[PDB]
Amino acid sequence: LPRDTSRCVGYHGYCIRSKVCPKPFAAFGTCSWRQKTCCV
């Protein structure tokens, strides 16, 4: 996996290509590289 993807999925949620996460989710830093945002 990219770099931080495994970090966020180690929690509970998913990674999206967007800087606005659908609710209920929070923008947890960055997922794959700096392209995807972590939604947990």
Side-chain angles (χ1 to χ4, degrees):
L1 285 76
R3 62 170 289 157
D4 280 81
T5 318
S6 310
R7 168 176 181 192
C8 313
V9 64
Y11 291 87
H12 305 269
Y14 57 102
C15 300
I16 68 176
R17 26 62 259 152
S18 190
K19 305 226 70 64
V20 179
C21 287
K23 282 63 186 290
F25 283 98
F28 190 108
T30 43
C31 269
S32 314
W33 311 119
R34 60 176 58 178
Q35 302 286 270
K36 323 185 89 76
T37 310
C38 305
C39 304
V40 287

Short mmCIF file of all heavy atoms in Angstrom, two decimals:
data_model
loop_
_atom_site.label_atom_id
_atom_site.label_comp_id
_atom_site.label_asym_id
_atom_site.label_seq_id
_atom_site.Cartn_x
_atom_site.Cartn_y
_atom_site.Cartn_z
N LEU A 1 0.85 -1.21 0.00
CA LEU A 1 0.00 0.00 0.00
C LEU A 1 0.87 1.25 0.00
O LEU A 1 1.99 1.22 0.50
CB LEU A 1 -0.94 0.02 1.22
CG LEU A 1 -2.15 -0.92 1.15
CD1 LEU A 1 -1.75 -2.37 1.40
CD2 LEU A 1 -3.21 -0.49 2.15
N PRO A 2 0.35 2.35 -0.59
CA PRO A 2 1.03 3.65 -0.70
C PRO A 2 1.95 4.02 0.47
O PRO A 2 3.16 3.83 0.39
CB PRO A 2 -0.16 4.59 -0.76
CG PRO A 2 -1.15 3.85 -1.59
CD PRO A 2 -0.97 2.39 -1.25
N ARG A 3 1.38 4.55 1.56
CA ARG A 3 2.19 4.96 2.70
C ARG A 3 1.36 5.11 3.98
O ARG A 3 1.68 4.52 5.00
CB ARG A 3 2.97 6.26 2.38
CG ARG A 3 2.10 7.48 2.07
CD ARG A 3 2.94 8.75 2.02
NE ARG A 3 3.42 9.15 3.34
CZ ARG A 3 4.49 9.92 3.56
NH1 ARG A 3 5.20 10.38 2.54
NH2 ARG A 3 4.85 10.22 4.81
N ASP A 4 0.27 5.88 3.91
CA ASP A 4 -0.55 6.16 5.09
C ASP A 4 -1.90 5.47 4.98
O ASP A 4 -2.71 5.53 5.91
CB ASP A 4 -0.74 7.67 5.25
CG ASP A 4 0.46 8.34 5.91
OD1 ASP A 4 1.46 8.61 5.21
OD2 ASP A 4 0.40 8.60 7.13
N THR A 5 -2.14 4.80 3.86
CA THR A 5 -3.38 4.07 3.65
C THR A 5 -3.59 3.02 4.74
O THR A 5 -4.66 2.96 5.36
CB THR A 5 -3.35 3.37 2.28
OG1 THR A 5 -2.80 4.26 1.30
CG2 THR A 5 -4.75 2.94 1.87
N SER A 6 -2.56 2.22 4.99
CA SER A 6 -2.62 1.16 5.99
C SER A 6 -2.83 1.73 7.38
O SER A 6 -3.39 1.07 8.26
CB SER A 6 -1.32 0.34 5.94
OG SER A 6 -1.01 -0.05 4.62
N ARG A 7 -2.38 2.95 7.57
CA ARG A 7 -2.50 3.64 8.84
C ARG A 7 -3.97 3.91 9.17
O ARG A 7 -4.45 3.57 10.25
CB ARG A 7 -1.71 4.94 8.78
CG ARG A 7 -1.97 5.90 9.93
CD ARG A 7 -1.06 7.11 9.82
NE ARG A 7 -1.25 8.05 10.91
CZ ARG A 7 -0.75 9.28 10.93
NH1 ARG A 7 -0.06 9.73 9.88
NH2 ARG A 7 -0.95 10.07 11.97
N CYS A 8 -4.67 4.50 8.22
CA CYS A 8 -6.05 4.89 8.42
C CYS A 8 -7.00 3.69 8.41
O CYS A 8 -7.95 3.64 9.18
CB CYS A 8 -6.44 5.87 7.34
SG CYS A 8 -5.21 7.19 7.11
N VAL A 9 -6.72 2.72 7.55
CA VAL A 9 -7.56 1.52 7.48
C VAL A 9 -7.30 0.63 8.70
O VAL A 9 -8.08 -0.27 9.01
CB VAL A 9 -7.32 0.73 6.17
CG1 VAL A 9 -5.91 0.20 6.09
CG2 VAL A 9 -8.34 -0.39 6.02
N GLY A 10 -6.20 0.91 9.39
CA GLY A 10 -5.94 0.28 10.66
C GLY A 10 -6.94 0.73 11.71
O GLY A 10 -7.10 0.09 12.75
N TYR A 11 -7.60 1.84 11.42
CA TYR A 11 -8.70 2.32 12.25
C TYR A 11 -10.01 1.71 11.75
O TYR A 11 -10.17 0.49 11.75
CB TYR A 11 -8.75 3.86 12.23
CG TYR A 11 -7.59 4.52 12.95
CD1 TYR A 11 -6.38 4.77 12.30
CD2 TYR A 11 -7.70 4.88 14.29
CE1 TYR A 11 -5.33 5.38 12.97
CE2 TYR A 11 -6.66 5.49 14.95
CZ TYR A 11 -5.47 5.73 14.29
OH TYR A 11 -4.43 6.33 14.95
N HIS A 12 -10.94 2.55 11.30
CA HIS A 12 -12.23 2.08 10.80
C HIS A 12 -12.79 3.09 9.81
O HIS A 12 -13.22 4.17 10.21
CB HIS A 12 -13.27 1.89 11.92
CG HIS A 12 -12.84 1.01 13.05
ND1 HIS A 12 -13.08 -0.35 13.08
CD2 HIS A 12 -12.20 1.30 14.20
CE1 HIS A 12 -12.60 -0.85 14.21
NE2 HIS A 12 -12.06 0.13 14.90
N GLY A 13 -12.78 2.75 8.54
CA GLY A 13 -13.28 3.66 7.54
C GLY A 13 -12.75 3.33 6.17
O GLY A 13 -12.66 2.15 5.81
N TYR A 14 -12.38 4.35 5.41
CA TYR A 14 -11.89 4.14 4.05
C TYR A 14 -11.22 5.39 3.49
O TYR A 14 -11.25 6.45 4.10
CB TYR A 14 -13.03 3.68 3.13
CG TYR A 14 -14.22 4.61 3.05
CD1 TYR A 14 -14.39 5.45 1.96
CD2 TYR A 14 -15.18 4.63 4.05
CE1 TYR A 14 -15.49 6.29 1.88
CE2 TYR A 14 -16.28 5.46 3.97
CZ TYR A 14 -16.43 6.29 2.88
OH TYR A 14 -17.52 7.12 2.80
N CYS A 15 -10.62 5.23 2.32
CA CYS A 15 -9.87 6.30 1.68
C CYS A 15 -10.57 6.76 0.42
O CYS A 15 -11.00 5.94 -0.40
CB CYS A 15 -8.46 5.80 1.34
SG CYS A 15 -7.50 5.24 2.79
N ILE A 16 -10.69 8.08 0.25
CA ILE A 16 -11.36 8.64 -0.91
C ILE A 16 -10.47 9.64 -1.62
O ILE A 16 -9.55 10.21 -1.03
CB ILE A 16 -12.67 9.36 -0.53
CG1 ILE A 16 -12.36 10.63 0.26
CG2 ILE A 16 -13.59 8.45 0.26
CD1 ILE A 16 -13.57 11.47 0.59
N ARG A 17 -10.74 9.84 -2.89
CA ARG A 17 -10.11 10.91 -3.64
C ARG A 17 -10.96 12.17 -3.55
O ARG A 17 -11.74 12.49 -4.45
CB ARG A 17 -9.90 10.50 -5.11
CG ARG A 17 -10.88 9.44 -5.66
CD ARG A 17 -12.33 9.90 -5.66
NE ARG A 17 -13.10 9.35 -4.53
CZ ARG A 17 -14.16 9.95 -3.98
NH1 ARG A 17 -14.56 11.13 -4.41
NH2 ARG A 17 -14.81 9.35 -2.99
N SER A 18 -10.76 12.91 -2.47
CA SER A 18 -11.49 14.13 -2.19
C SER A 18 -11.03 14.67 -0.85
O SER A 18 -10.57 13.90 0.00
CB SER A 18 -13.00 13.86 -2.15
OG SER A 18 -13.75 15.06 -2.12
N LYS A 19 -11.13 15.97 -0.64
CA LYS A 19 -10.68 16.56 0.61
C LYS A 19 -11.87 16.82 1.53
O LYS A 19 -11.71 17.41 2.61
CB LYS A 19 -9.90 17.86 0.36
CG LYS A 19 -8.74 17.68 -0.60
CD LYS A 19 -7.47 18.35 -0.09
CE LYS A 19 -6.89 17.61 1.11
NZ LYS A 19 -6.44 16.23 0.76
N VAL A 20 -13.04 16.39 1.11
CA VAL A 20 -14.24 16.48 1.94
C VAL A 20 -14.85 15.10 2.13
O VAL A 20 -15.43 14.52 1.20
CB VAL A 20 -15.29 17.43 1.33
CG1 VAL A 20 -16.53 17.49 2.21
CG2 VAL A 20 -14.72 18.82 1.13
N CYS A 21 -14.72 14.57 3.33
CA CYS A 21 -15.23 13.25 3.65
C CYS A 21 -16.73 13.27 3.89
O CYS A 21 -17.25 14.16 4.56
CB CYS A 21 -14.51 12.69 4.88
SG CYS A 21 -12.79 12.19 4.55
N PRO A 22 -17.45 12.28 3.32
CA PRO A 22 -18.88 12.10 3.56
C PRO A 22 -19.15 11.77 5.02
O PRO A 22 -18.36 11.09 5.66
CB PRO A 22 -19.26 10.92 2.68
CG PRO A 22 -17.99 10.22 2.36
CD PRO A 22 -16.91 11.27 2.40
N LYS A 23 -20.27 12.23 5.53
CA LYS A 23 -20.59 12.02 6.93
C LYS A 23 -21.37 10.72 7.14
O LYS A 23 -22.09 10.27 6.25
CB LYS A 23 -21.35 13.22 7.51
CG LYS A 23 -20.46 14.42 7.84
CD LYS A 23 -19.79 14.99 6.60
CE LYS A 23 -18.79 16.08 6.95
NZ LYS A 23 -19.45 17.32 7.44
N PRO A 24 -21.21 10.11 8.31
CA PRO A 24 -20.32 10.63 9.33
C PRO A 24 -18.90 10.06 9.22
O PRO A 24 -18.67 8.88 9.46
CB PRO A 24 -21.00 10.16 10.60
CG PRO A 24 -21.60 8.84 10.24
CD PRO A 24 -21.91 8.90 8.76
N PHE A 25 -17.96 10.93 8.88
CA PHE A 25 -16.55 10.59 8.83
C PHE A 25 -15.73 11.86 9.01
O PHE A 25 -16.23 12.97 8.77
CB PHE A 25 -16.17 9.92 7.51
CG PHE A 25 -16.57 8.47 7.41
CD1 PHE A 25 -17.72 8.08 6.75
CD2 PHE A 25 -15.77 7.49 7.99
CE1 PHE A 25 -18.07 6.75 6.67
CE2 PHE A 25 -16.12 6.16 7.91
CZ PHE A 25 -17.27 5.78 7.25
N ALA A 26 -14.49 11.70 9.44
CA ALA A 26 -13.61 12.84 9.64
C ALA A 26 -12.40 12.73 8.74
O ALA A 26 -11.94 11.63 8.42
CB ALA A 26 -13.18 12.91 11.10
N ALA A 27 -11.88 13.88 8.31
CA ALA A 27 -10.71 13.92 7.46
C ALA A 27 -9.46 13.59 8.26
O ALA A 27 -8.82 14.48 8.84
CB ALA A 27 -10.58 15.29 6.80
N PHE A 28 -9.13 12.32 8.31
CA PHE A 28 -7.99 11.83 9.07
C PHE A 28 -6.72 11.97 8.23
O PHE A 28 -6.37 11.08 7.45
CB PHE A 28 -8.24 10.37 9.49
CG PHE A 28 -7.25 9.81 10.48
CD1 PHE A 28 -7.62 9.58 11.80
CD2 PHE A 28 -5.95 9.50 10.10
CE1 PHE A 28 -6.73 9.07 12.71
CE2 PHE A 28 -5.05 8.98 11.01
CZ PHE A 28 -5.44 8.77 12.32
N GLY A 29 -6.06 13.12 8.36
CA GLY A 29 -4.78 13.35 7.70
C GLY A 29 -4.82 13.08 6.21
O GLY A 29 -5.61 13.69 5.48
N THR A 30 -3.99 12.16 5.77
CA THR A 30 -3.90 11.81 4.36
C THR A 30 -3.72 10.32 4.17
O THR A 30 -2.98 9.66 4.90
CB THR A 30 -2.73 12.55 3.69
OG1 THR A 30 -1.57 12.52 4.53
CG2 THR A 30 -3.12 13.98 3.38
N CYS A 31 -4.42 9.81 3.18
CA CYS A 31 -4.30 8.44 2.74
C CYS A 31 -3.28 8.40 1.62
O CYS A 31 -2.49 9.32 1.51
CB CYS A 31 -5.64 7.89 2.28
SG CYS A 31 -6.60 7.06 3.59
N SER A 32 -3.31 7.32 0.83
CA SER A 32 -2.37 7.08 -0.25
C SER A 32 -1.69 8.35 -0.75
O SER A 32 -2.30 9.19 -1.42
CB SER A 32 -3.11 6.41 -1.40
OG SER A 32 -3.93 5.36 -0.91
N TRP A 33 -0.41 8.47 -0.39
CA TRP A 33 0.42 9.61 -0.74
C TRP A 33 -0.15 10.90 -0.15
O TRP A 33 -0.27 11.01 1.07
CB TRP A 33 0.58 9.67 -2.26
CG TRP A 33 0.99 8.34 -2.81
CD1 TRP A 33 0.30 7.58 -3.71
CD2 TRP A 33 2.15 7.58 -2.44
NE1 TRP A 33 0.99 6.41 -3.96
CE2 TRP A 33 2.12 6.39 -3.19
CE3 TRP A 33 3.21 7.81 -1.56
CZ2 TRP A 33 3.12 5.43 -3.08
CZ3 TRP A 33 4.19 6.85 -1.45
CH2 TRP A 33 4.14 5.67 -2.21
N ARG A 34 -0.48 11.87 -0.98
CA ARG A 34 -1.18 13.06 -0.50
C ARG A 34 -2.38 13.34 -1.40
O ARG A 34 -2.84 14.47 -1.52
CB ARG A 34 -0.26 14.28 -0.43
CG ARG A 34 0.37 14.67 -1.76
CD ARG A 34 1.21 15.93 -1.63
NE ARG A 34 2.27 15.79 -0.63
CZ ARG A 34 3.16 16.75 -0.35
NH1 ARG A 34 3.14 17.90 -1.01
NH2 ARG A 34 4.08 16.54 0.58
N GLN A 35 -2.86 12.28 -2.03
CA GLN A 35 -3.91 12.39 -3.02
C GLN A 35 -5.26 12.06 -2.41
O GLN A 35 -6.27 12.70 -2.72
CB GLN A 35 -3.62 11.44 -4.17
CG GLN A 35 -2.28 11.70 -4.81
CD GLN A 35 -2.28 12.94 -5.68
OE1 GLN A 35 -2.57 12.88 -6.87
NE2 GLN A 35 -1.97 14.08 -5.08
N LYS A 36 -5.28 11.07 -1.55
CA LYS A 36 -6.52 10.61 -0.96
C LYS A 36 -6.58 11.03 0.50
O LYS A 36 -5.56 11.09 1.18
CB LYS A 36 -6.64 9.09 -1.07
CG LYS A 36 -6.08 8.52 -2.37
CD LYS A 36 -6.35 7.03 -2.47
CE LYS A 36 -7.69 6.73 -3.12
NZ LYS A 36 -7.65 6.93 -4.60
N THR A 37 -7.77 11.36 0.97
CA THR A 37 -7.97 11.72 2.36
C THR A 37 -8.55 10.52 3.11
O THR A 37 -9.32 9.74 2.53
CB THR A 37 -8.91 12.93 2.49
OG1 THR A 37 -8.46 13.98 1.62
CG2 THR A 37 -8.97 13.44 3.92
N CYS A 38 -8.17 10.34 4.37
CA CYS A 38 -8.68 9.23 5.15
C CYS A 38 -10.00 9.59 5.79
O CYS A 38 -10.11 10.62 6.45
CB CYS A 38 -7.67 8.85 6.22
SG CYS A 38 -6.00 8.50 5.60
N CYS A 39 -11.00 8.75 5.59
CA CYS A 39 -12.31 8.98 6.17
C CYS A 39 -12.60 7.93 7.23
O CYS A 39 -12.83 6.76 6.92
CB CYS A 39 -13.37 8.95 5.08
SG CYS A 39 -13.06 10.14 3.73
N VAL A 40 -12.58 8.36 8.49
CA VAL A 40 -12.85 7.48 9.61
C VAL A 40 -13.73 8.19 10.64
O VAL A 40 -13.54 9.41 10.84
CB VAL A 40 -11.56 6.98 10.29
CG1 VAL A 40 -10.85 5.96 9.42
CG2 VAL A 40 -10.63 8.14 10.57
#
